Design a protein around this ligand. Structure first.
Ligand SMILES: Nc1ncnc2c1ncn2[C@@H]1O[C@H](COP(=O)(O)OP(=O)(O)OP(=O)(O)O)[C@@H](O)[C@H]1O
Ligand SMILES: Nc1ncnc2c1ncn2[C@@H]1O[C@H](COP(=O)(O)OP(=O)(O)O)[C@@H](O)[C@H]1O
Ligand SMILES: COCCOCCOCCOc1ccc(C(C)(C)CC(C)(C)C)cc1
Ligand SMILES: [Mg+2]
Ligand SMILES: [Mg+2]
Lengths: 50, 526, 487, 170, 250, 140
């Protein structure tokens, strides 16, 4: 009973840490993509206004 | 030739194009021939289009020779490779270029058959391994994954499944002969050379072609190697032939797709992959099928290999391919190291095709091995490391695992009788050490034929044309049953009398090593 | 009147952008381009406006060989799918193009695919019960009309036979058709299920079929696979509203419906919140589920298979699915190998309608007493494996007998497999089943042996098998006595 | 004349297997005959029992599989693969007109043991084998028993007493 | 400095064992002459010491030539190695030497620390192709070559892949691993070191380096802390030429 | 409020569709301000303002009995108390499944009528003893 009570908590924190490390890697990648979007410039958009 | 535009920038293997003033429409997945020089040409492919006018392009050859300002011509046609029976003997390049060593065109991306163009799987594909052919049988049209860490036996399993098909396809007609297509993605060129030399040594390349996209090759060529292999399998499907298709491996194909998608600024996702990498592998594996009798009854089987890391299965790609495939095989390093080779984990390994692939002689055998191993685990798991257990379940299971341990494939006739003896208890009095020597004497030698016991009209283990009666009638049939029992009983008595007595008397120093080497050579040849 | 036309301006995977010269159509509006260009017909639904004249559209087929600035015809509305009696015994993709090769479909009307959910006035707060006829379901897990059910089963657990029997029972008892939706279905299991629906005559090609089929296969893009369940639900809402009846909706894995929607949101560029599931998880799931409700005019119940990645229930996709489900039909290989069929494990299963405010009082008290009994039986089985049955008192072995009798009585045959295995199937009512379990609980039927309850249905039917067994044993005794007396 | 035949999915199936039988009988080599079954399948006109039996007739009467020779060639495994295809894949069962070819082949090859399996299988399934072929099989059996061809020589060779990998020839 | 990899016809795999004198290596991972070796390991495990010992043992008896490539190595270990080769007279200036030493160290920028191994291969493939000699190619280490381009891909604007590596990692590593190979002309018996940060095998750079080698020697903190050196885990490491036929059956 | 976790999910949708920088458990970072705007509007007004009231019982979903979730602890960092229902007890028959250890009322002692205050004190002491005497034996 005790071993099971520890095993469920261990599996839970294992999956918690797994999901948090996945979310973290995702937010790193999205931060970098966003920084690159900021690095890229806007164009001119020249057209007739009259 | 009329061009579409000119190169604008390159990022390693990736390129980009800027269209000319004469704005001409370009399709989405066609081929672009770039004129890097006056003679040499760099083939390429369109991968995306943009509002302002630009073309992201993957380059399939001569990347170093690319420079800005070059002309860029268009084909107006999808990618296609040479196709036919004039390719089974030769290594190739996924562009069809034959690789050296010391007409008909087919599309790389075709839609898979619908349900009406298919048939439920009914015939087996013999890997030659008792492990696979008993408990998780492989059918034709049955895509089945191979997982495991590094250096477990994945390539060896997928290559012995090819070597087994040389003895048979020579004999049988060329309509039911399952051929094969190995596909190496990102593997070392010396591994490819050793595979070439091995299949040439065993004459297995007559029924086996190879698709090579090495680590030095472009990411787009590693991306399109499995499509080339599948396209080769598709003419066999439409011509009724049977064909196998191996991928070593898809994790590198997905790394290459990641490289492509990130360099072309596609939106990333889990493990930095895009969203449609599940759809990428579904474009490929779903092309495997068991076609309909309205469609030649051909078939394409698949054995995709995928390397795990620290026995992880929660990974994205592993999760996806398991969600796609019609079963799986799972190799373990903790068992590979423990003398268990092939180091399967039978509980995690699954074949949803349980019996419809198996033969009449095979259903009884594999069902007995299931009803033996499900109990062997409940017993072996609870017993200590030091307890002695004298029970038919633990005995038959240990001897069965010994028989499951073997280098290289095994003939069907060889695979059945050695397990029939276990399931019916004939292989109980022998020792756990001498099981493979028992098997070597049963199959290759013939003890009753040597020692005069010839009270058996037809049943002997030297003809090897008897398995074609075993597959049809089955050993449980009344004419084959008693002769089988008599041959096995007489072989067992001759063994236990002549050999098992001499064995235990070898209480020397070099004799025990000469015997250990004998048993570990019998394990290899059998 | 004329029809609107636009021009492509970029293609990135499934995503395509379409410039126009007039007011952009609404979102989810369908845009067709002729089959002469691509080689096959091609439809794209608007998802995301970019300016006053651009329209991002997700594509449901392969956009290969699609040139730039090709003309693209606006359908005038969203994806109109067939509906009706002619739909039965057929297969349809998301667009309503039949893929079973069995000729055209002779339909009268053609409804759009993204119909709004029923209003609160159209709802019916009264929670009702669907008489399934399967005592195992009816006792412990009463399928609520207009409710959601989870189905947890891998391979070789009778999942197919269960869903076929459910189709049959709802087709004959409540007179209502059904519908299956294979989202990301393995095409081998698609063949093995489309041929089982011919061997079981649930789809009588030369007669009256019962279920509609909608197969969005793995070879299809996620823009299609995500819009498959909406197709099957448009098929079901016609039978709910117009035919005015009850309907089943079987849904291949919600895990793969969520994955497909994640892929759609990825291709659209939406930042993944969590492990990789879309940020619009609960929104896209609720737009589907809130249409799956009871009404004053009929009902659609939905049995949904769910895959749990890594056996973790805390993941947001399972957790959001459970927040909408009402019952959980768990299946176990253990009871299946032990002969019990249907392979339901009632103690680890659970339901939401288990309340006498919803159901009658006797059915609740009986079910809770059976759950208490089986819990005590699990405890005593864990004691017997340690101590032994002889250690137990006379009171304990009585309930261990009654629990064994109950577990053997849960084993039921099936009219689906009546041709395969030979034994008849039994459609047993609700009140009769409650009286049977109340007798078996009050002990007024204890003289019957254990094995007589194996693979039967109803107390009024098992007694014939008990009499047959007694007659057989008496005939074997009368044979052995005279065979010994003659010699 | 020919009864109705239906596919798995219920579609109508052709029965006019006439000209394909002559297309098989004209096959100079018994693999071009198997290459006609592909066209029969692709034409929605699968092969019948008489068609499989024409194929077995050509597997017997032809000299080789293709123009050039082949290593490990065997007519028997070809026939038995056709029989397992007839029985397991399709369901059609062979007849005396088929086991006749199978037995004439085993008599020509001289594999008297498989011949006795064919006699015990025709006698288990309730078929009357030709006594001419039974006598020829027993004649070849007595011949091999006289000339020591009953078993090979490499099995009659004495086993090594030493447990050497070289002595056992692994 | 950049050249195309040897064609499959040009390549040549000859099964020939190398005697290192080391007792783990001579049993579990019998190194193949002309093949590739990889010392996977974290920090503080002894891979550099194993490289120094293998130099001490092989290069003396090696009648051919040798090349060492320091890629992000410490400059103190570079000094110690140069002074050791001078004391052993492997480097004999007044006489004749048989060891090239190329060094781009931790102090050097990434464009150097990435373009060192290619310099060492410009040195080695000359002795292989032209001179026809046998060559030794020690590399310490491939991980600094990897992270040198990882530190630059972000500045180039390439979107990063998972754990913080460049998207072109597999291709960039393959362009080096395929150039590192014996041919018909000669044989490079290469040895490589690899840094496994945090002792995490799931790292994709080791995961991609596994396939591209023949002897995947592995070192572990658990064996190192127990007082056992070289801290090899024979169960976690396995070679390619560990066959029945290539080596003795006993 | 049934429920705040799905309010935070809806605002998370809006944030991620606006490409706002996420934070812990995918959330932007102003979800605490988002909930404080909502739960600070609850108050017992003063006699200078009418002595009215706005009581607020928000509902929040846990995962596998985990009060260490980000939203759960953000809202415990705002609310004036806690009532914790346990799925272990809900499965084990006790309904309502309140855990008295993990539940508390930080202010309600002043509002509890003396007739109920004394009974609550007695039963609080009784259950504080029961929780210990029930666990110390552990079936010994
Ligand atoms: N049944 C067996 N008996 C003895 N040795 C075996 C057996 N199966 C595999 N091996 C050995 O395992 C080694 C590696 O095999 P294989 O290349 O198939 O593994 P792998 O996992 O494919 O390697 P990689 O991860 O590099 O692809 C080979 O040296 C082979 O000799
Ligand atoms: N037999 C041994 N006894 C004691 N220490 C040893 C032994 N072998 C190796 N070491 C230790 O290994 C250490 C780390 O060496 P180093 O080569 O820097 O590791 P790495 O190559 O991983 O950077 C040295 O400090 C040395 O003490
Ligand atoms: C009183 O009314 C209750 C109604 O509840 C209906 C919804 O129930 C949600 C289902 O909850 C679970 C709980 C556990 C599991 C297990 C642990 C059995 C799943 C497992 C083994 C796949 C991880 C599955 C679903
Ligand atoms: Mg391999
Ligand atoms: Mg070091």
């Amino acid at each position: 009973g005790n071993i099971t009570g520890l095993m469920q908590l261990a599996d839970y924190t294992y999956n918690k840490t797994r999901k948090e490390l996945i979310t973290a890697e995702l937010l790193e990648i999205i931060g970098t993509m966003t920084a690159m979007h900021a690095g890229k410039k806007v164009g001119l958009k020249k057209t007739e206004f009259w | 030739k009329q061009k579409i535009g000119f190169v604008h920038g390159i990022d390693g293997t990736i390129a980009t194009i800027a269209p000319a003033a004469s704005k001409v429409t370009v399709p989405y997945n066609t081929v672009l021939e770039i004129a890097v020089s006056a003679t040499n040409i760099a083939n390429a492919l369109v991968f995306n289009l943009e509002k302002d006018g630009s073309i992201g392009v993957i380059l399939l050859d001569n990347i170093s020779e690319v420079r800005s300002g070059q002309d860029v011509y268009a084909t107006g046609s999808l990618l296609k490779i040479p196709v036919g029976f004039h390719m089974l003997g030769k290594i190739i390049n996924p562009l069809g270029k034959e690789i050296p060593t010391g007409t008909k065109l087919g599309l790389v991306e075709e839609m898979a058959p619908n349900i009406v163009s298919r048939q439920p799987v009914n015939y087996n594909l013999l890997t030659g391994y008792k492990v696979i052919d008993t408990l998780i049988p492989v059918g034709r049209g049955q895509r089945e994954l191979i997982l495991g860490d590094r250096q477990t036996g994945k390539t060896s399993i997928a290559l012995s499944t090819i070597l087994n098909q040389t003895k048979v396809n020579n004999e049988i007609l060329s309509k039911n002969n399952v051929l094969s297509v190995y596909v190496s993605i990102g593997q070392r060129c010396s591994n490819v050379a050793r595979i070439h030399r091995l299949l040439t040594e065993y004459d297995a390349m007559k029924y086996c072609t190879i698709v090579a996209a090495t680590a030095a090759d472009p990411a787009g060529l590693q991306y399109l190697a499995p499509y080339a292999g599948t396209t080769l399998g598709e003419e066999f499907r439409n011509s009724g032939r049977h064909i196998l298709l191996v991928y070593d491996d898809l994790s590198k194909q997905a790394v290459s797709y990641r490289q492509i998608s990130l360099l072309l600024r596609r939106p990333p996702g889990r493990e930095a992959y895009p969203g449609d990498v599940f759809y990428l592998h579904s474009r490929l594996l779903e092309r495997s099928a068991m076609m309909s009798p309205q469609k030649g009854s051909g078939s394409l089987t698949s054995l995709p290999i995928v390397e795990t890391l620290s026995n992880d299965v929660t990974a994205y790609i592993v999760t996806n391919v398991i969600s796609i495939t019609d079963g799986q095989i799972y190799l373990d390093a903790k068992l590979f190291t423990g003398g268990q080779r092939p180091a399967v984990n039978i509980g995690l390994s699954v074949s949803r095709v349980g019996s419809s692939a198996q033969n009449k002689a095979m259903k009884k055998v594999g069902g007995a091995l299931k009803m033996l191993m499900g109990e062997y685990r409940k017993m072996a798991g609870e017993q200590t490391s030091g307890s002695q257990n004298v029970s038919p379940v633990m005995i038959r299971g240990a001897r069965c695992l010994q028989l499951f341990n073997q280098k290289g494939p095994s003939y069907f006739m060889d695979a059945i009788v050695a397990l029939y003896a276990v399931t019916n208890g004939y292989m109980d009095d022998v020792k756990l050490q001498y099981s493979k020597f028992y098997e070597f004497l049963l199959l290759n030698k013939d003890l009753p034929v040597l020692y005069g016991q010839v009270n058996n009209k037809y049943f002997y283990m030297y003809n090897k044309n008897l398995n074609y009666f075993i597959r049809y009638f089955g050993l449980n049939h009344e004419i084959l049953e008693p002769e089988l029992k008599k041959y096995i009983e007489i072989h067992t008595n001759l063994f236990l009398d002549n050999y098992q007595s001499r064995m235990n008397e070898l209480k020397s120093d070099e004799d025990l090593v000469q015997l250990k080497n004998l048993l570990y050579a019998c394990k290899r040849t059998v | 009147d004329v029809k609107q036309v636009g021009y492509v301006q970029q293609i990135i995977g499934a995503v395509v952008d379409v410039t126009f010269t007039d007011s952009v159509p609404p979102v989810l509006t369908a845009l067709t381009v002729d089959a002469k260009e691509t080689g096959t017909l091609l439809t794209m639904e608007i998802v995301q406006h970019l300016d006053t004249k651009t329209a991002r559209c997700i594509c449901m087929s392969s956009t290969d060989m699609l040139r730039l600035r090709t003309p693209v015809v606006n359908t005038g509305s969203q994806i109109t799918v067939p509906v009706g009696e002619a739909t039965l015994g057929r297969i349809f993709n998301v667009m309503g193009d039949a893929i079973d090769q069995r000729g055209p479909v002779k339909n009268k009307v053609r409804w759009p695919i993204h119909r709004k959910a029923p209003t609160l006035a159209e709802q019916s707060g009264k929670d009702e019960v669907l008489v399934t006829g399967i005592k195992v379901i009816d006792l412990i897990l009463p399928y609520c009309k207009g409710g959601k059910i989870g189905l947890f089963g891998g391979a070789g657990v009778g999942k197919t036979v269960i869903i076929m029997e459910l189709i049959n029972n709802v087709a004959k008892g409540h007179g209502g058709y059904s519908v299956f939706a294979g989202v990301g279905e393995r095409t081998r299991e698609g063949t093995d299920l489309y041929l089982e629906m011919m061997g079981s005559k649930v789809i009588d090609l030369q007669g009256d079929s019962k279920c509609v089929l909608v197969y969005g296969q793995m070879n299809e893009p996620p823009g299609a696979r995500a819009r498959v369940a909406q197709t099957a639900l448009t098929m079901a809402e016609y039978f709910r509203d117009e035919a005015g009846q009850d309907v089943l909706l079987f849904v291949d894995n919600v895990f793969r419906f969520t994955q497909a929607n994640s892929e759609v949101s990825a291709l659209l560029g939406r930042i993944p919140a969590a492990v990789g599931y879309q940020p619009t998880l609960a929104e896209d799931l609720g737009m589907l589920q809130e249409r799956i409700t009871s009404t004053v005019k009929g009902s659609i119940t939905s049995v949904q298979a769910v895959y749990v990645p890594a056996d973790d229930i805390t993941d947001p996709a399972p957790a959001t699915t459970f927040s909408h489900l009402d019952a959980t039909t768990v299946l176990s290989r253990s009871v299946a190998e032990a002969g019990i069929y249907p392979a339901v494990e009632p103690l680890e299963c659970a339901s939401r309608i288990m309340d006498p405010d919803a159901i009658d009082v006797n059915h609740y008290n009986v079910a809770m007493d059976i759950v208490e009994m089986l819990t005590k039986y699990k405890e005593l089985q864990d004691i017997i494996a340690v101590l032994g049955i002889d250690e137990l008192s006379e009171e304990d072995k009585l309930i261990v007998d009654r629990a064994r009798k109950v577990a053997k009585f849960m084993s039921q045959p099936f009219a689906v497999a009546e041709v395969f295995t030979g034994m008849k199937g039994y459609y047993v009512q609700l009140e009769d089943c409650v009286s049977d379990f109340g007798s078996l609980l009050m002990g007024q039927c204890d003289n019957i042996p254990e094995m007589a309850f194996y693979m039967v249905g109803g107390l009024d039917s098992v007694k014939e098998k008990a009499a047959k067994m007694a007659a057989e044993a008496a005939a074997m005794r009368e044979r052995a006595r005279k065979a010994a007396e003659a010699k | 004349a020919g009864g109705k035949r239906y596919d798995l999915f219920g579609y109508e199936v052709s029965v006019a297997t006439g000209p394909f039988i002559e297309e098989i009988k004209k096959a100079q080599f018994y693999d071009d005959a198997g290459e006609v079954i592909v066209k029969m399948n692709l034409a929605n006109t699968p092969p019948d029992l008489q068609t499989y039996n024409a194929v077995l007739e050509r597997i017997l009467n032809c000299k080789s599989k293709r123009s050039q020779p082949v290593k490990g060639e065997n007519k028997f495994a070809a026939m038995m693969d056709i029989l397992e295809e007839m029985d397991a894949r399709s369901g059609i069962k062979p007849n005396a007109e088929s086991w006749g070819y199978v037995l004439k082949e085993l008599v020509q090859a001289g594999d008297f043991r498989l011949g006795w399996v064919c006699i015990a299988g025709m006698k288990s399934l309730g078929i009357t084998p030709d006594q001419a072929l039974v006598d020829a099989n027993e004649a070849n059996a007595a011949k091999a028993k006289a000339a020591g061809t009953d078993f090979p020589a490499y099995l009659k060779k004495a086993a090594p007493e030493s447990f050497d990998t070289k002595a056992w020839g692994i």
